[PDB]
Design a protein around this ligand. Structure first.
Ligand code: CLA
Ligand code: CLA
Ligand code: CLA
Ligand code: CLA
Ligand code: CLA
Ligand code: CLA
Ligand code: CLA
Ligand code: CLA
Ligand code: CLA
Ligand SMILES: CC1=C(C/C=C(\C)CCC[C@H](C)CCC[C@H](C)CCCC(C)C)C(=O)c2ccccc2C1=O
Ligand code: SF4
Ligand code: SF4
Lengths: 742, 62, 41, 165, 158, 80, 143
């Protein structure tokens, strides 16, 4: 039972540019110098492969910690930039007065080559590139009413970025912690729950209560942002705050006497949306963050660090074992306290799932004022966080495989929960593959059969709502229970969590903030498609992880490495056997799945939720054609791809001409990726030989010998350009469409 | 002693060699009557990454 | 110091500086002599 | 200048379709302008854009461009004296510049090949020597002509590595 | 005392199988062992009979209730003729499998999990598979006809 | 099965033999090289064709070469 | 090495079972046996998947492929510095001494080995395939 304490080596590495002058210092093969042009790609590929640089885990941990400091400095630079642009290059103050009709914009282009046309008529006597990041909605929900506040926090963010870089330099060059510092996971959880999430949520609840809540209440009442009292005048002047919310006239006495019901005016459980702004009630969000803060503060006292109270996570792992799982979770504490890649796999998986949940929960329960009404930012946020989630999950698989090849020790995992998974990986993969086939056959024939029947002129034999009812009865049941939650199972809630469950469509300024979402047969089919695509991505990734060390084809695959191209053309051909290549295909399917998720989201919202109420029912964007057309591949091709592409392809001569140019360019990059994907190194190397002959003819032969990309690098470039082109095509399409239609 | 002296640059005449028609320094020549006694060292690496190999007396020129 | 200069002389940093300057000059020429479809005569 | 019609292309200056193109763009600009009050900065920016469009269209009229049925200028690249500024002169400028770039590269690669460790200097560029060779490459056409005449531009066949065939 | 359930196949941990509550449970084992395919001492023809009857009986139903003529009054007759046609196709598949599959000696024997040496299944032979195919054909056609009868007869069918 | 051929440029470095995952290659005495040993491929039937020997051969061009031919069970590397 | 070592009934390594073991190929066609002498009890990695404990003294292990047996033996030699031999076992019940096939590991030159599949020429001296046209030749390599 080691005592948790602070441990450091003083001045472990001097601060010097001698390593900057020498590329590839971190390695041994790259340190000697470039013999061939492969060396550049090798340098960049293993730039952040700290495990392959040094054997000792202490130096790796220090490198990771200071690299995290550098990333956080980069993120703070990005935030400083966004706030600074929102201050000197935006119409945030104009948008504040008319958020329903002024398009948010925080980027203005220089008028050089005729690109000034990209400065669109976004309103407010302003021109610029309309933004979809939702930053304006975030600032309004945070209570920012002036550009000076944006400038002030931007400068703060820049200072914090400098501090983050200084902290990384300090914790690598001056005060690098020892390995026993990083391995204090109990303390880590205690702090990252109570102090990062707990105290962070408490701080944000306090901000929301004292700054965002009064300012946004005045904005809701119709008060001009330039007439609202400043935030310090609300936080400090208790009479001013109590004028808006009379519970503040009682001070902290109800808080400290457990008379918390007196705070019910500014700490509510209303549920639903603000009818004026179309966002979540800010009293609800303040109460939310308060309870989250309390829950995390309590949960951060779970683990024992230096005083006997608390848990030891090793013990609670090892005590969980059973008749089917052998020794159970024994040895996993060693895995996750002596392998960075294992932790990275778990954390990336959970981060990716979380980003996905974030997208779902933000479209369905818009947390910001005038966010739902701005359809472009809502679609953009959903699609963005979906893509981030899918990428993070693919990385989680990759780092799981990396751990499995490199840091997995059979001695410390004899009969534990991991070794038994490795002992029936054949059953897992075969059942998953069977599931994957089943799912694909059924779901695709649900679309292909419909295509065939429609083409044969047999709509009564289709799987549409009219012909054959494949109703998602279970999802409709969940919708019903959630719409009736505020009456029986959530009695203190004044309303449902989202209006998507049912009843009382929410409209702000004509356009619909939120509308109950129905689920017909097209929703059934597309959701089973989603499950199919997820299950195939999981098949690929889990097969890569489980067969990372060995297989019946290659038993000695662990020593071949995590990232090797093949084992040769023998055994019939051993291409793409490495778990890295599984992440390649895994990445591909991930992309494919997300492409369907975001297409379903965009079409369903344009057809059945988004629109404008005019007193004579809803006028949706596409007119509700999803329910009757999204049961056929032809329907998606025609009524979603072909129909909604008119905005992006006819965007030339307007501010969306940039989106049209990116649409074409991303198409090109995707097709360009097909070059790297469909070809192989041998051809390109021979072409290089001919070109090198041509150069040697004129004595232009480089000292660094030209080489074709490695096979792994060729696959890497292919998947990277494919993902770039596909996603940027969808990005340009979605943004141009949703900005033009509004 | 037969073949090129040590240190001289020899033009490779083996058609299949990566350094065909290129010049390489002679490191050593084996006098025990082996088939490929001439060890030639090369500034530039082949596709396998090696900088040297063995040649016969008729596969080099100086 | 000198090593940092050597670091600057590396291929990526030098490519970035050279293309930054080149883009700058080309942009300035397209600002002061804009919209040039052909060489006038 | 007034250019003769060529290849069934009328001059852009006297082309009605060119005037229609100008008119259309200017009207679009006006429409964009109308929503902005004149005092605000977008109004002045749009007026400057309109000015820029007018002077561009005027310059294209005077520059001896031939327009088609569509109404947009068309380039004559066959070598015609009346349209040499379309391709020949910028073509000569490109050939001069590109040959400068290539000759600076060839000179640096040949000079670095004499270094003790040429491949390290290939990625860490000796900036003073590099710039010296770059500015010496101003006279690329001359030096290339010297290399061609002296036979040192092109390496002989025997020295170059080739396939066994 | 710390009982482990999942065990290797027949106690040999070097064969590609594991005995689990899905494979070696007494109820599962008794159900599967009592199915006609696993009655190796019974004549292949009669095992094929029951097989065909069960299979041809159920396989008709999808064609009845989801076929092209499901709405028409002739839905049942169409579905049963579809089922009979599928039985004929499966008979062809069985005949070709029986012709091709059993061409090797298979010198290795077979034993039970208790270690009792037992004779090979007569079904697992060319002539035995032919007899099984004939039993399949008779059983499948009888089962299809029975499904037709029951759709025309059964009181609560709709 | 595949065909594996050893050529007289072999220096007897043994790397082909050490790289073989199926024990196809072996070192035999030989007077042709300095090291005094040449590789051979007696157990050619076991050659899966993975070409690890060619990857591990330092001599230019390769002294060991694998030519993929008739595919058998062992050559296909099947556990079934 | 007067005679190849015979194959006794030696204890197998402790293993909880796996789905990666012998398939029907062991029954119909062949399977391979790896036997090695262990200096001490230790945990090794199965080539099929999972972790097993080898017993002190002789051990016997049956695997689907020669490649699996040789990979595991190479692990034992390079890490634990053990000695092992491989057998091929047919369904008829005749085993077959396989590794090293000489009593000497192939990487070490041993007297009595005869060169098989050796071409006494360089790779470029092979004739062209057009010269062996319409002949029962595998290729230029076999002439
Ligand atoms: C995520 C980070 C980020 C990104 C992508 C951008 C992107 C941009 N910025 Mg911003 N900026 C940022 C961070 C960022 N900035 C931060 C942290 C600061 C404070 C230090 C600024 C301060 C700033 C100013 C003051 C200006 C920009 C401008 C610009 C634009 C042109 C850049 C330029 O001058 O060419 C690159 C130029 C050189 C390399 C020289 C471009 C849209 C310019 C703009 O919008 O013009 C209208 C402008 O005037 N930025
Ligand atoms: C000027 C101050 C300074 C100096 C001289 C050094 C010097 C050194 N550091 Mg330290 N370091 C510093 C600041 C400094 N560091 C800071 C601020 C941090 C926190 C991030 C660190 C974190 C740190 C770690 C974790 C490690 C070092 C290491 C090293 C050594 C290797 C240097 C090298 O190859 O990097 C040259 C690298 C570059 C020039 C690339 C810099 C890229 C930055 C960090 C990322 C910023 C974002 C980027 C620009 C985004 C790209 C996007 C683009 C495409 C648009 C050397 C002794 C390594 C070592 O082995 O030490 C012995 C090591 O592992 N340092
Ligand atoms: C109350 C205590 C507390 C808090 C708030 C944090 C917060 C954080 N830690 Mg943790 N950590 C703690 C205690 C704490 N830690 C303890 C006790 C240990 C030792 C067991 C660690 C060990 C640890 C490791 C090994 C790593 C982190 C990382 C991180 C950062 C993750 C990025 C993120 O979520 O951005 C949230 C961003 C913000 C909250 C913005 C402000 C950022 C600053 C840095 C917050 C200040 C926190 C600091 C503890 C207080 C200043 C102390 C300083 C003056 C000495 C986050 C800033 C990772 C990281 O990114 O490294 C930098 C990482 O690799 N921590
Ligand atoms: C982290 C979040 C956060 C923060 C910072 C605050 C902060 C505040 N709240 Mg709020 N509040 C929060 C969350 C938060 N709240 C939540 C979650 C709820 C819901 C229950 C409330 C509900 C609430 C109510 C209902 C009221 C407040 C009030 C207040 C203020 C009273 C502070 C006070 O005197 O108490 C005591 C504080 C201290 C004793 C600490 C002061 C110690 C100083 C800083 C020590 C410095 C000494 C230094 C060493 C040397 C001095 C010299 C040096 C400067 C040179 C303060 C601005 C009151 C108010 O006036 O609001 C308008 C009020 O009526 N809060
Ligand atoms: C918390 C996140 C995280 C962290 C810390 C790491 C860290 C690491 N990863 Mg993991 N990974 C992640 C996320 C993460 N990755 C995700 C999300 C994926 C899925 C894509 C992967 C997939 C992955 C694979 C497949 C591999 C790694 C590898 C590695 C290691 C070396 C990385 C390196 O030096 O490359 C430096 C970075 C690069 C070379 C990338 C260059 C940029 C690419 C092309 C994308 C740029 C796209 C851009 C946004 C679009 C615009 C471009 C524009 C300029 C035109 C290092 C341990 C490698 C390894 O060996 O592990 C041990 C490895 O093989 N990772
Ligand atoms: C549209 C193109 C396409 C199609 C149809 C498939 C189909 C398939 N892929 Mg491939 N794949 C593709 C593109 C495609 N992939 C691309 C471009 C990539 C990137 C490299 C991948 C990468 C890839 C990997 C890495 C994996 C797959 C897997 C799969 C299978 C998933 C199971 C499934 O769909 O259910 C079954 C098949 C279908 C539904 C396919 C369509 C068939 C329709 C419904 C017709 C049905 C029968 C019809 C009536 C014909 C009978 C009559 C006829 C004889 C006349 C399946 C075979 C996974 C797999 O095999 O495991 C299950 C897997 O692991 N694929
Ligand atoms: C897998 C996806 C899928 C599905 C669900 C359907 C479904 C259907 N099609 Mg479509 N179709 C599809 C794909 C699909 N099709 C594709 C890809 C094509 C090619 C273009 C077609 C072309 C097509 C045509 C041309 C026609 C149909 C027709 C039909 C219907 C009757 C088919 C029939 O007689 O089945 C017979 C079914 C069976 C014999 C068995 C089905 C499987 C059983 C129920 C599985 C049960 C397993 C069980 C759960 C396991 C239990 C184990 C336990 C004992 C232990 C039905 C609605 C016909 C129609 O008009 O009807 C509307 C028609 O004319 N289809
Ligand atoms: C906006 C204008 C523009 C731009 C961006 C480009 C861009 C490019 N051109 Mg193009 N080009 C243009 C206008 C333009 N060109 C015009 C107007 C002409 C007519 C003269 C050409 C004629 C031209 C030719 C003939 C070639 C290019 C090539 C190239 C590429 C490399 C050029 C270079 O300097 O590399 C750096 C320069 C070097 C490495 C030196 C290489 C030799 C250079 C290109 C020419 C010098 C040889 C000499 C004068 C004899 C010319 C013989 C020729 C008439 C057949 C690059 C993509 C080259 C290419 O990609 O082809 C594969 C190429 O061969 N261009
Ligand atoms: C030293 C510079 C240099 C020179 C003089 C040449 C010259 C030539 N190249 Mg090569 N080439 C170079 C660099 C160079 N190349 C580089 C860096 C690449 C990698 C992108 C290539 C890739 C390449 C290919 C793929 C092909 C050629 C071909 C050709 C021939 C056609 C004309 C041409 O350049 O069009 C091609 C022009 C380009 C591809 C543009 C790249 C040239 C860049 C701009 C030069 C960069 C170096 C620059 C001068 C800075 C270094 C010096 C500085 C530090 C002082 C000609 C023999 C073609 C051939 O065989 O024709 C017979 C052909 O197929 N080249
Ligand atoms: C196109 C292609 C290549 C050939 C690509 C070559 C080797 C490299 C790509 C070109 C880069 C741009 C060369 C780097 C140029 C230098 C950095 C020079 C400076 C740039 C100046 C021109 C400005 C492969 O090697 C390959 C390998 C495996 C699978 C697929 C493929 C593949 O599709
Ligand atoms: S073949 Fe290549 S590797 Fe095997 S011995 Fe002869 S030379 Fe050394
Ligand atoms: S191919 Fe694989 S198996 Fe056949 S010899 Fe070369 S290495 Fe040994």
């Amino acid at each position: 039972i080691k005592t948790v304490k602070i441990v450091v080596d003083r001045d472990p590495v001097p601060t010097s540019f001698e390593k900057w002058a020498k590329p590839g210092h971190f390695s041994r093969t790259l340190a000697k110098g470039p013999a061939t042009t492969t060396w550049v790609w090798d340098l960049h590929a293993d730039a952040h492969d700290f495990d392959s640089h040094t054997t000792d885990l202490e130096d790796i941990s220090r490198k990771v910690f200071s690299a995290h400091f550098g990333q956080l400095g980069v993120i703070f630079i990005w935030l400083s930039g966004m706030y600074f642009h929102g201050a000197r290059f935006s119409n945030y103050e104009a948008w504040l007065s008319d958020p329903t009709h002024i398009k948010p914009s925080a980027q203005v282009v220089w008028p050089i080559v005729g690109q000034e046309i990209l400065n669109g008529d976004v309103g407010g006597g302003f021109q610029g590139v309309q933004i979809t990041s939702g930053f304006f909605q975030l600032w309004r929900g945070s209570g920012i009413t002036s550009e000076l506040q944006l400038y002030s926090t931007a400068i703060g963010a820049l200072i914090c970025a400098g501090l983050m870089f200084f902290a990384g330099w300090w914790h690598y060059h001056k005060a690098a912690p020892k390995l026993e510092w990083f391995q204090n996971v109990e303390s880590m959880m205690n702090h990252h729950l109570a102090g990062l999430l707990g105290l962070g949520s408490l701080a944000w609840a306090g901000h929301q209560i004292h700054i965002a809540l009064p300012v946004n209440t005045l904005l809701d009442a119709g008060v001009d942002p330039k007439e609202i009292p400043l935030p310090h005048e609300f936080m400090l002047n208790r009479a001013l705050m109590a004028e808006l919310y009379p519970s503040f006239a009682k001070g902290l006495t109800p808080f400290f006497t457990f008379n918390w019901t007196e705070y019910s005016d500014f700490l509510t459980f209303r549920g639903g949306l603000n009818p004026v702004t179309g966002g979540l009630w800010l009293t609800d969000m303040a109460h939310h963050h308060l309870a989250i803060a309390v829950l995390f503060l309590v949960a951060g006292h779970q683990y024992r660090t230096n005083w006997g109270i608390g848990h030891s996570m090793k013990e609670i792992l090892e005590a969980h074992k059973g008749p089917f799982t052998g020794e159970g979770h024994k040895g996993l504490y060693e895995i996750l306290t002596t392998s960075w890649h294992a932790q990275l796999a778990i954390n990336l998986a959970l981060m990716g799932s979380l980003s996905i949940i974030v997208s779902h929960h933000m479209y369905s329960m818009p947390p910001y004022p005038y966010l739902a009404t701005d359809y472009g930012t809502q679609l953009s946020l959903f699609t963005h966080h979906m893509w981030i989630g899918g990428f993070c999950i693919c990385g989680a698989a990759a780092h799981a495989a990396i751990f499995m090849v490199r840091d997995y020790d059979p001695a410390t995992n004899y009969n534990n929960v991991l070794d038994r998974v490795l002992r029936h990986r054949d059953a897992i993969i075969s059942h998953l593959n069977w599931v994957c086939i089943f799912l694909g056959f059924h779901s695709f024939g649900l679309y292909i059969h419909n295509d065939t029947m429609s083409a044969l002129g047999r709509p009564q034999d289709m799987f549409s709502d009219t012909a054959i009812q494949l109703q998602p009865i279970f999802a409709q049941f969940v919708q019903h229970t959630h719409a009736l939650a505020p009456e029986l199972t959530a009695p203190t809630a004044a309303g449902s969590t989202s209006a998507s469950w049912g009843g009382d469509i929410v409209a702000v300024g004509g356009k619909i903030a939120m509308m109950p979402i129905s689920l017909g047969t097209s929703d059934f089919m597309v959701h089973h498609i989603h499950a199919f695509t997820i299950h195939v991505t999981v098949l690929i990734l889990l097969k890569g992880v489980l067969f990372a060390r060995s297989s019946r084809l290659i038993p000695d695959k662990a020593n071949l490495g995590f990232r090797f191209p093949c084992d040769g053309p023998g055994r019939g051909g051993t291409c793409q056997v490495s778990a890295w290549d599984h992440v390649f295909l895994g990445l591909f399917w991930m992309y494919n799945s997300i492409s369907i998720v975001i297409f379903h989201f965009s079409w369903k919202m344009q057809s059945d939720v988004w629109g404008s109420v005019t007193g004579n029912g809803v006028s949706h964007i596409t007119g509700g054609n999803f329910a009757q057309s999204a049961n056929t591949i032809n329907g998606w091709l025609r009524d979603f791809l072909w129909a909604q592409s008119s905005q992006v392809i006819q965007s030339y001569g307007s501010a969306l001409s940039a989106y049209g140019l990116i649409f074409l360019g991303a198409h090109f990059i995707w097709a360009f990726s097909l070059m790297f994907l469909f070809s192989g190194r041998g051809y390109w190397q021979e072409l290089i030989e001919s070109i090198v002959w041509a150069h040697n003819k004129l004595k232009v032969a480089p000292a660094i010998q030209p080489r074709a990309l490695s096979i792994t690098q060729g696959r890497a470039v292919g998947v990277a350009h494919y993902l770039l082109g596909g996603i940027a095509t969808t990005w340009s399409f979605f943004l141009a469409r949703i900005i033009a239609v509004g | 002693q037969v073949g090129p002296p040590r240190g001289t640059m020899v033009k490779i005449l083996r058609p299949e060699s990566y350094w065909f028609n290129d010049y390489g320094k002679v490191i050593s020549v084996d006098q025990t009557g082996v088939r490929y006694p001439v060890v030639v060292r090369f500034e530039k690496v082949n596709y396998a990454g090696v900088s040297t190999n063995n040649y016969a007396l008729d596969e080099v020129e100086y | 110091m000198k090593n940092f200069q050597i670091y600057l002389s590396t291929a990526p940093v030098l490519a970035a500086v050279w293309f930054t300057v080149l883009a700058g000059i080309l942009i300035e020429l397209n600002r002061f002599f804009p919209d040039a479809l052909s060489f006038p005569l | 200048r007034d250019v003769q019609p060529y290849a069934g292309l009328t001059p852009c200056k006297t082309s009605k379709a060119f005037a229609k193109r100008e008119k259309t763009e200017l009207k679009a600009l006006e429409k964009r302008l109308k929503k902005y009050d004149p005092e605000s900065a977008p109004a002045l920016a749009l007026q400057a854009t309109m000015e820029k469009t007018k002077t561009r269209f005027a310059n294209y009229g005077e520059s001896g461009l031939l327009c088609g049925k569509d109404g947009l200028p068309h380039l004559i690249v066959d070598g015609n004296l009346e349209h040499l500024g379309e391709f020949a002169i910028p073509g000569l400028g490109f050939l001069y510049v590109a040959g400068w770039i290539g000759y600076a590269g060839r000179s640096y690669i040949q000079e670095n090949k004499t270094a003790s460790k040429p491949t390290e200097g290939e990625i860490i560029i000796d900036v003073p020597k590099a710039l010296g060779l770059m500015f010496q490459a101003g006279a690329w056409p001359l030096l290339a002509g010297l290399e061609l005449k002296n036979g040192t531009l092109t390496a002989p066949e025997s020295e170059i590595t080739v396939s066994p065939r | 005392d710390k009982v482990q359930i999942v065990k290797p196949i027949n106690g040999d941990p070097f064969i590609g199988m594991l005995e689990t509550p899905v494979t070696s449970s007494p109820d599962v084992a008794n159900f599967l062992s009592n199915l006609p395919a696993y009655r190796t001492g019974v004549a292949p023809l009669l095992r094929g009979v029951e097989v065909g009857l069960a299979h041809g009986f159920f396989v008709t139903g999808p064609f009845i209730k989801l076929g092209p003529l499901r709405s028409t009054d002739a839905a049942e007759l169409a579905g049963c003729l579809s089922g009979a046609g599928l039985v004929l196709i499966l008979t062809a598949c069985l005949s070709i499998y029986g012709a091709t599959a059993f061409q090797r000696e298979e010198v290795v024997g077979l034993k039970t999990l208790s270690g009792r040496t037992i004779a090979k299944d007569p079904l697992q032979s060319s002539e035995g598979w032919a007899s099984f195919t004939s039993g399949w054909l008779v059983g499948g056609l009888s089962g299809v006809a029975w499904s037709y009868v029951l759709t025309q007869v059964l009181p609560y069918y709709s | 099965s595949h065909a594996v051929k050893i050529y007289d440029t072999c220096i007897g470095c043994t790397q082909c033999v050490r790289a073989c995952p199926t024990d196809v290659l072996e070192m035999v005495p030989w007077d042709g090289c300095k090291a005094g040993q040449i590789a051979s491929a007696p157990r050619t039937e076991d050659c899966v064709g993975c070409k690890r020997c060619e990857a591990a051969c330092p001599t230019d061009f390769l002294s060991v070469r694998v030519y993929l031919g008739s595919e058998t069970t062992r050559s296909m590397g099947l556990a079934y | 090495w007067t005679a190849p070592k015979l194959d006794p009934n030696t204890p197998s390594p402790i293993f909880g079972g796996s789905t990666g073991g012998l398939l029907r190929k062991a029954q119909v066609e062949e399977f391979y046996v790896l036997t090695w002498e262990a200096k001490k009890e230790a945990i090794f990695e199965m080539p099929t998947g999972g972790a097993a404990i080898m017993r002190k003294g002789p051990n016997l292990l049956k695997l689907a492929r020669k490649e699996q047996c040789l990979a595991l033996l190479n692990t034992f030699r390079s890490k634990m510095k053990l000695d092992g031999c491989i057998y091929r076992v047919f369904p008829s019940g005749e085993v077959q001494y396989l590794h090293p096939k000489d009593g000497v590991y192939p990487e070490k030159v041993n007297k009595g080995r005869v060169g098989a599949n050796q071409n006494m020429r360089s790779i470029g001296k092979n004739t062209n395939p057009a010269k062996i046209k319409f002949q029962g030749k595998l290729g230029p390599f076999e002439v």
